[PDB]
Design a binder for this molecule. Sequence first.
Ligand code: HEM
Ligand code: HEM
Ligand code: IC6
Ligand code: IC6
Lengths: 439, 444
Amino acid sequence: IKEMPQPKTFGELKNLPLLNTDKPVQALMKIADELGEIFKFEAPGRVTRYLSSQRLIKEACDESRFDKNLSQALKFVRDFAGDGLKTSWTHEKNWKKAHNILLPSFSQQAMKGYHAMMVDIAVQLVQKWERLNADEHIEVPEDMTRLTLDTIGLCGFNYRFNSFYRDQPHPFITSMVRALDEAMNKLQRENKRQFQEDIKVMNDLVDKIIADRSDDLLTHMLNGKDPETGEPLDDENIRYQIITFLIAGHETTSGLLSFALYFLVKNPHVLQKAAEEAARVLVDPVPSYKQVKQLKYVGMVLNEALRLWPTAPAFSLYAKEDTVLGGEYPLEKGDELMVLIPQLHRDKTIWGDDVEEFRPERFENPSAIPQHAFKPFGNGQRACIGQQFALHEATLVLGMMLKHFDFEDHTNYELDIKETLTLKPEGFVVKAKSKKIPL
Amino acid sequence: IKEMPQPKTFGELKNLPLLNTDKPVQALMKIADELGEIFKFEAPGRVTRYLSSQRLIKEACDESRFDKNLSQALKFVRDFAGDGLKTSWTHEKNWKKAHNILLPSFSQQAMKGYHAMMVDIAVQLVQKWERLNADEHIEVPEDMTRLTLDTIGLCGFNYRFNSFYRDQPHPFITSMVRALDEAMNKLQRDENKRQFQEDIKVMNDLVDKIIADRKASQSDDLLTHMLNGKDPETGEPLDDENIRYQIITFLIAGHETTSGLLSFALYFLVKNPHVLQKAAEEAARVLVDPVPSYKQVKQLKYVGMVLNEALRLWPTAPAFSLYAKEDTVLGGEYPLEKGDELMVLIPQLHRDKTIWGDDVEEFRPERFENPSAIPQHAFKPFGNGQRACIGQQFALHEATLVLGMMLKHFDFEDHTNYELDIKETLTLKPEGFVVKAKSKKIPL
Ligand code: HEM
Ligand code: HEM
Ligand SMILES: O=C(CCCCCn1ccnc1)N[C@@H](Cc1ccccc1)C(=O)O
Ligand SMILES: O=C(CCCCCn1ccnc1)N[C@@H](Cc1ccccc1)C(=O)O
């Protein structure tokens, strides 16, 4: 019925040069602003469709009609993440098998065992900031990445990256980041030689984490059995899961903490409510698990930060069979879709006309949010298995940050969103004035 | 660990005779004025604590520490509302099941289907007022009740009470009101019991009549979801017994608190002409068509602030009850044992000077310009958490639409210089509130 719009083309390259830019997600958002809820995007050897409305995305989230597709970004991540959970197809045997084995270690109930090690790294962050000299500022995304990397290293694998003891990030991050950089750079197109060297460095630490082998993920991956097949994970897939969780378990989370702190200092009314809750609830020197679940408004702050800037800003789907999207866009079996999460979260027909404003009170009552309107952690059985982990860590850390310091946007920072495969506010810096509450 | 104060006692009756008064909520507010943010209240076989400060109520709204309790009022309403949504305990299977089944029919998105029938009744209200003769006046709470009862009857169940064709209420209303009256009368204190059962039968008769007529005529309404909706957890639909209780619940819950809100809002507007002017200007600017649209109603921002400010000063469901899930300490100085009850005195909470400033009694809708500037749990006219009012958006959409049309089509005069007199049932209303409306002669 309806003919789909399409952005400007570049001859034989079609739409591909539109992604030859350092902020491709923000470029795709602007195109969505111009073209609406759906537009076709073409590249040599590829056709996909970018969805932006809750009306169409709720249909795309029907798992009986659409399954997770590996985007080109995920295909490049697969080169070192293998058939780990995030880069495996749903129909590959190792997805469901690893899913069954690892889901128990990610329950809201499983966070109780991780909590103490999360506090360990969180205290290290607070002490660094307590120990700054007068007029010394904080590099927010840099320190958040220190925290989330160390948290997943310790909580997941009882490995200490000791990022707060370094200026130059761990030998694993640079290789991982340069691999991730080559993955994203390849989308926008001796790099091949460096790509393999970085992959070896990652496989090097992974076999080092494994070699000597607690209350962590590595235990379940070495001892857990899939109740379906009765099998445990084989050694090859275990390595891929370790690589997967080290990546997936840190960078989207540090972005979330970075954006949350940005929005707080840009909205002092909100920071006051959040800081009062942290002070009222976190009455002990070390926060407990139960106290963290009580940080309701802090959780609302985090969800609203995820609304405006979801740090994993898209996911891909393919049609399981011939079907019609929205009653006017017919699709053939295998046709691909892209869900543009930042645009979905700005659907005025869902959230009202003031979508760009940071208002955590949108999330005061979760039942008021329509289905599939809010998708920062993906969809269905392929949703983010680490969702509860990420939110408990971020709630704990932001709560501790708000309890122990007042924050100043001393440079009046202008939001600049650096894009890798994830989003971060580049150059975000603050000053912290300690409230002198002991640990 | 502070010992909480307690109002005057009457021997073995303890505090109970203090409720033997025709304005008990306003009586309890005065006691709060004298005793402060918390006072114990005792009756034979009952002990509860009335909270009045945002400081303590924000803790009471922690759902991990406190759950909804059935007040004695709700226990008496349960005698004919059963395990419907409002009178069921959270741990009863039928609460979560009905909650899951009925939320889709109450989304901010679900109002789009209700909007046309809301306009149907709202136009009937405007036309009644257009048709008054000179020097005739309007009985505000009576007409607002005509409006809200007909709206929930039509929107909810495709049943027309036709209240604007009657001086005497529909037989269900008279029984329902007298049942609600007996429920409240039982609190402050026979053959009332014989009449109580007759009124319950009249209510069940209309309910069983609406079910019959629907089964002999698929609509877009509440009754449809109650007959066809499935709980996504269990896959079960509601059984017939609970369906009847939900109908009774929504007919009660869906009208009387809403008519109070409209009545109080119009009172505060005519007592504050600068506010009425701002609200009327927004109505004229936004409602540019003869029939208001759904989208235009969401654009009545100031009217919505007017409604929230009326709900601040006189929340028409003036209290709700909670019990401690486990042993806990309230405010760092009031220890509570598992099962201890609390009462949240909403009108007093909304007059907390530490939250709203020294001008708490003044009607200033601009207080609600920014929700982020309002401390947590300072404003609770629709309850708390998962047991909050499921009809909140329904109520606010209806009142915004109707108040918008009222301000568009008429100028209003407080011709008697009305003295606010708040009648108390289980809800609050401004008794005897009357105005004159001078039509602006804008066609529909
Ligand atoms: C704020 C933090 C996070 C965000 C916004 C986020 C976002 C997402 C999204 C959108 C997906 C779906 C990807 C797709 O459909 O292609 C996903 C999947 C996944 N995430 Fe996260 N994530 C976060 C934190 C974490 C953490 C902390 C972990 C590990 C502890 C993790 C591990 C995973 C895994 C393993 C998958 C693949 C699940 C599967 O397909 O079976 N994530 N994440
Ligand atoms: C201005 C109008 C209204 C006010 C002030 C109001 C107030 C409240 C309050 C305070 C509660 C919580 C009671 C408690 O905790 O014991 C509640 C619950 C409830 N209300 Fe309303 N309400 C209004 C309109 C409506 C409407 C229009 C409907 C139906 C369409 C409705 C249906 C309900 C139901 C079913 C519950 C029980 C929800 C549950 O516990 O699952 N209310 N209301
Ligand atoms: O939009 C994106 C960004 C998605 C990255 C999300 C990765 N993530 C998810 C969870 N943690 C990381 N990617 C498209 C771009 C493209 C379109 C057409 C042709 C070539 C490339 C793609 O990769 O296919
Ligand atoms: O204060 C109240 C007010 C009732 C709230 C209105 C109920 N509602 C909610 C939504 N629509 C109606 N009720 C107490 C009074 C009392 C205290 C101690 C002993 C006896 C009676 C109670 O019922 O327990």
